[PDB]
Antibody
Framework: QVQLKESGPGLVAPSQSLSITCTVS????????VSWVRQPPGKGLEWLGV???????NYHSALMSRLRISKDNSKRQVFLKLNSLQTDDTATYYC???????????WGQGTLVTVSSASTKGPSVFPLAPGTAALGCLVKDYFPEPVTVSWNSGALTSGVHTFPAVLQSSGLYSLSSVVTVPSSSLGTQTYICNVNHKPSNTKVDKKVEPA | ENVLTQSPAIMSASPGEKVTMTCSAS?????MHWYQQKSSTSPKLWIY???KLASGVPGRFSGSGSGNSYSLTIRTMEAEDVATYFC?????????FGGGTKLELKRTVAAPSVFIFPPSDEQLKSGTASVVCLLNNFYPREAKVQWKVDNALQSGNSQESVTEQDSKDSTYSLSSTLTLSKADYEKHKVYACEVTHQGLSSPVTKSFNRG
């Protein structure tokens, strides 16, 4: 079963270098080419390059040979290295592989890379306190993306809408997560939002209580 | 490079309607591949080598064409077909994708539920007031949210965020956040949002009094 998984830094500064690793499984790297594709946030897909089984490579010429792709067969890893970064390189980066023919059929989950001179900040989390009631949490002033939010650790998914993050005029992101529930259940059930920001090692669990 | 132009870029279709989207290349290619992407997760191969459905893909989908001009067609539009669709060619370097075709489901009018949240006491002590207007489960996307502070219309001080179309009911949700300093917030008494939407007879207002 072909699997691919990317890992890299969430945040790197301009003119520095980016490096991401793809761990692969289910096929021989000696036999099969592996490619890299990125997606700038809210835009389309761009192919970056490919390393064939024999070790030869092809790169998108627009990159101006700022990109190098390499691999180690015994580790089962493929490495993306991108030099002299510009804020334009901020993107979700995917490793991917064809199946039959040349269409890409297997994709990693992808890894968001933000290119910025700004520093990590963890969010503050504030309750939005509540026959249909809404309640929520406001996840304010964090950097960079992304934040993950769940309600009652996954037990509550019906009624849950988590908005896209918005860049505020301060250069920080904020988002809201809400859930609709019956009025009747406010007095009985407790509601807790679980917020996670990996780039700062912040895990906040916030009770949202009627006022 | 070989530029792929997809048309239309934005499209909606009522359930059971035939939809078609084209991808055009500036130079001829051996085949065209198509990817479906839902809600910023990894793209999924959908159609490969021009007309072969990937496994799992239902028979209402088809692709055709040759040379420079390819098409993806859905005979009966379903709610689960809401997605962005990207064409891709791998017949010559650099490999290239189209800019995408965003497919919306054009369902029946549904009026929003409206909720207002005052800032939490915890946010206020940090020096900031975020007031939140929630519009839940509505259709179409076009809505007018207007903030009034002591019956005065606000301008340029609120940010809006919208969910993608829901998988089950095909509605939207919208949050709008009015952000100001605590010192400014405590200088006014009544905060209200006013929602206009074709699912509503007259504009709906929700409001509170600081206290």
């Amino acid at each position: 079963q072909v699997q691919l998984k990317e890992s890299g830094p969430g945040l790197v500064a301009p003119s520095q270098s980016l490096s991401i690793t793809c761990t692969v499984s289910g096929f021989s790297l000696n036999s099969y080419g592996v490619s890299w594709v990125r997606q700038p946030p809210g835009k389309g897909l761009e192919w970056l390059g490919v390393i064939w089984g024999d070790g030869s490579t092809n790169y998108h010429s627009a990159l101006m040979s700022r990109l190098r792709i390499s691999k180690d067969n015994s580790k089962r890893q493929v490495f993306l290295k991108l030099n002299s970064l510009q804020t334009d390189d901020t993107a979700t980066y995917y490793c991917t592989k064809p199946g039959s023919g040349y269409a890409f059929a297997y994709w990693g989950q992808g890894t968001l890379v933000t290119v910025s001179s700004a520093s990590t900040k963890g969010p503050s989390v504030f309750p939005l306190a509540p026959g249909t009631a809404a309640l929520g949490c406001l996840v304010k002033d964090y950097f960079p993306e992304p934040v993950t939010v769940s309600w009652n650790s996954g037990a509550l998914t019906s009624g849950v809408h988590t908005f896209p993050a918005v860049l505020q005029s301060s250069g920080l992101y904020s988002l809201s997560s809400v859930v609709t529930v019956p009025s009747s259940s406010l007095g009985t059930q407790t509601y807790i939002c679980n917020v996670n920001h990996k780039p700062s090692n912040t895990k906040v669990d916030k009770k949202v209580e009627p006022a | 490079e070989n530029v792929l132009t997809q048309s239309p870029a934005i499209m909606s279709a009522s359930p059971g309607e035939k939809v078609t989207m084209t991808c055009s290349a500036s130079s001829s290619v051996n085949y065209m591949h198509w990817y479906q992407q839902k809600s910023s997760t990894s793209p999924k191969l959908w159609i490969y080598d021009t007309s072969k459905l990937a496994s799992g893909v239902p028979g209402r989908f088809s692709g055709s064409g040759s040379g420079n001009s390819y098409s993806l067609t859905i005979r009966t539009m379903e709610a689960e077909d809401v997605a962005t669709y990207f064409c891709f060619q791998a017949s010559g370097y650099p490999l290239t994708f189209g800019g995408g075709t965003k497919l919306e489901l054009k369902r029946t009018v549904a009026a929003p539920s409206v909720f207002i949240f005052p800032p939490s006491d915890e946010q206020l002590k940090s020096g900031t007031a975020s007031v939140v207007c929630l519009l839940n489960n509505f259709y179409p996307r076009e809505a007018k949210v207007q903030w009034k502070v002591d019956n005065a219309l606000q301008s340029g001080n609120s940010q809006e965020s919208v969910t993608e179309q829901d998988s089950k009911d095909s509605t939207y949700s919208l949050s709008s956040t009015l952000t100001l300093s605590k010192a400014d917030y405590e200088k006014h008494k009544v905060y209200a949002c006013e929602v206009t939407h074709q699912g509503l007879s007259s504009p709906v207002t929700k409001s509170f009094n600081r206290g």
